[PDB]
């Protein structure tokens, strides 16, 4: 069995190997990359996402989100307070202000220490989940707006045509902006490109051990667990690496830098934080190997998770017994 310790793997495809996206994901899996839940892909030196980032300041962040924490430094939840609209140029100036900017630090490990010590005492503002793309239309390789759609994959594998669309999302971050522990909708893959700015640190639990994270989460967030049998779908709970280690939960960590891709694999729980002002683009995708994960994915039906239009068909076709309850939670 390849990668039996479930380490995060880093790949350096050549320009020739960068042509065929599906083939390269399958290659990474042949080497055991999925066992980690997360892989890094460094693009060939010949490749670029677009020519420059000099003309992005007028993008609008319609609903910036202030991420307010509750709990203790290593075990906390966050809620999202809506703020007034602002442009990316305005948000960049805010991220660089004395109130929000990255503190002085020695290296990524010192900044990680400072994150976990101090995150709860601040409320950073995240420009998340903005439909759109920063890839040039002429970029033909690993262009996250030109991937094969999940609806087409389900049709190819299973024979059933379904409604829905699959487009990318932009994320504008600042110091301490946080992504809570989660797997993707329907335990899909995700791919994330860091277009510009400061790094993003990731934590991930191997898919084979995801239920160990779920059991810890139920212990640590006992009111939330009574409320919903899949409350990590709410995307609000944080648990630090120190707490994971104290509780014996297998995990790994890695820092993504500008110009690098990350892929999350089906049922790979992940969480993390941004180092300073940055912009990322991400999208969900599927392969043949996903179908069995989609059929077994948990679902939130309490009403909290609320998701896109396109998840309806995935539940309806892959999980017909669960459909009626899940749809009630959507309505
Ligand atoms: O970058 C973020 O805030 C969160 N991203 C992801 O969870 C992802 O790409 O799967
Ligand atoms: Mg602009
Ligand atoms: Ni994700
Ligand atoms: Zn729920």
Swiss-Prot record:
Family, as annotated: Belongs to the JHDM3 histone demethylase family.
Name listed for the protein in its UniProt record: Lysine-specific demethylase 4D
Modified residues (PolyADP-ribosyl glutamic acid): 16-17
Cofactor(s) it depends on: Fe(2+)
Claim: Iron is one of the keywords in the record: yes
GO cellular component terms, A-Z: blood microparticle; chromatin; nucleoplasm; nucleus; pericentric heterochromatin; site of double-strand break
Main location: nucleus
Superkingdom of origin organism: Eukaryota
Catalytic activity: N(6),N(6),N(6)-trimethyl-L-lysyl(9)-[histone H3] + 2 2-oxoglutarate + 2 O2 = N(6)-methyl-L-lysyl(9)-[histone H3] + 2 formaldehyde + 2 succinate + 2 CO2
Binding site for Fe cation: 182, 184, 270
Cofactor note: Binds 1 Fe(2+) ion per subunit.
Alphabetical GO biological process terms: cellular response to ionizing radiation; chromatin remodeling; double-strand break repair via homologous recombination; inflammatory response; positive regulation of chromatin binding; positive regulation of double-strand break repair via nonhomologous end joining; regulation of gene expression; regulation of protein phosphorylation
Function: Histone demethylase that specifically demethylates 'Lys-9' of histone H3, thereby playing a central role in histone code. Does not demethylate histone H3 'Lys-4', H3 'Lys-27', H3 'Lys-36' nor H4 'Lys-20'. Demethylates both di- and trimethylated H3 'Lys-9' residue, while it has no activity on monomethylated residues. Demethylation of Lys residue generates formaldehyde and succinate.
MF terms (GO), sorted A to Z: chromatin DNA binding; damaged DNA binding; histone demethylase activity; histone H3K9 demethylase activity; histone H3K9me2/H3K9me3 demethylase activity; metal ion binding
Ligand binding (Zn(2+)): 228, 234, 300, 302
Places the protein is found: Nucleus
Residues of the full protein shown: 11 to 341 of 523
Gene of this entry: KDM4D
Entry binding sites for 2-oxoglutarate: 126, 192, 200, 235
This protein's UniProt keywords: ADP-ribosylation, Chromatin regulator, Dioxygenase, Iron, Metal-binding, Nucleus, Oxidoreductase, Transcription, Transcription regulation, Ubl conjugation, Zinc
PTM annotation: Ubiquitinated via 'Lys-63'-linked ubiquitin chains. Deubiquitinated by USP14 with the help of TRIM14 leading to stabilization.
EC number: 1.14.11.66
Keyword Phosphoprotein: no
Domain JmjN as annotated: residue spans: 8-50
Domain JmjC: 136-302
Lineage: Eukaryota, Metazoa, Chordata, Craniata, Vertebrata
């Amino acid at each position: 069995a390849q990668n039996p310790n479930c380490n995060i793997m880093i790949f350096h495809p050549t320009k020739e190997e960068f042509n065929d996206f599906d083939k390269y994901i399958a290659y990474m899996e042949s080497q055991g990359a999925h066992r980690a839940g997360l892989a890094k892909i460094i693009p060939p030196k010949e490749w670029k996402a677009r020519e420059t980032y000099d003309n992005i300041s007028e993008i609008l962040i319609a609903t910036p989100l202030q991420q307010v924490a509750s709990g203790r430094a290593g075990v906390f939840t966050q809620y999202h307070k809506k703020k007034k609209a602002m442009t990316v140029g305005e948000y960049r100036h805010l991220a660089n202000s004395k109130k929000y900017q990255t503190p002085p630090h020695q290296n990524f490990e010192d900044l990680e220490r400072k994150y976990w010590k101090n995150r709860i005492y601040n409320s950073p503002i995240y420009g998340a989940d903005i439909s759109g793309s920063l890839f040039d239309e002429n970029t033909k390789q690993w262009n996250l707006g030109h991937l094969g759609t999940i609806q087409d994959l389900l049709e190819k594998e299973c024979g059933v045509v379904i409604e829905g669309v699959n487009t990318p999302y932009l994320y504008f971050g600042m110091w301490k902006t946080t992504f809570a522990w989660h797997t993707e909708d329907m335990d899909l893959y995700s791919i994330n490109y860091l277009h510009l700015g400061e790094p993003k640190t990731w934590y991930v639990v191997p898919p084979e051990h995801g239920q160990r994270l779920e059991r810890l989460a139920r212990e640590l967030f006992p009111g939330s667990s009574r409320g919903c049998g899949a409350f990590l779908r709410h995307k609000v709970a944080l648990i630090s690496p120190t707490v994971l280690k104290e509780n014996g939960i297998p995990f790994n960590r890695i820092t993504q830098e500008a110009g690098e891709f990350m892929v999350t694999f089906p049922y790979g729980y992940h969480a993390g934080f941004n180092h300073g002002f940055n912009c990322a683009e991400a999208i969900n995708f599927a392969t043949p190997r996903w179908i069995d994960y989609g059929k077994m994915a948990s679902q939130c039906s309490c009403g909290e998770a609320r998701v896109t239009f396109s998840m309806d068909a995935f539940v309806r076709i892959l999980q017909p017994e669960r459909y009626d309850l899940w749809k009630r939670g959507q309505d």
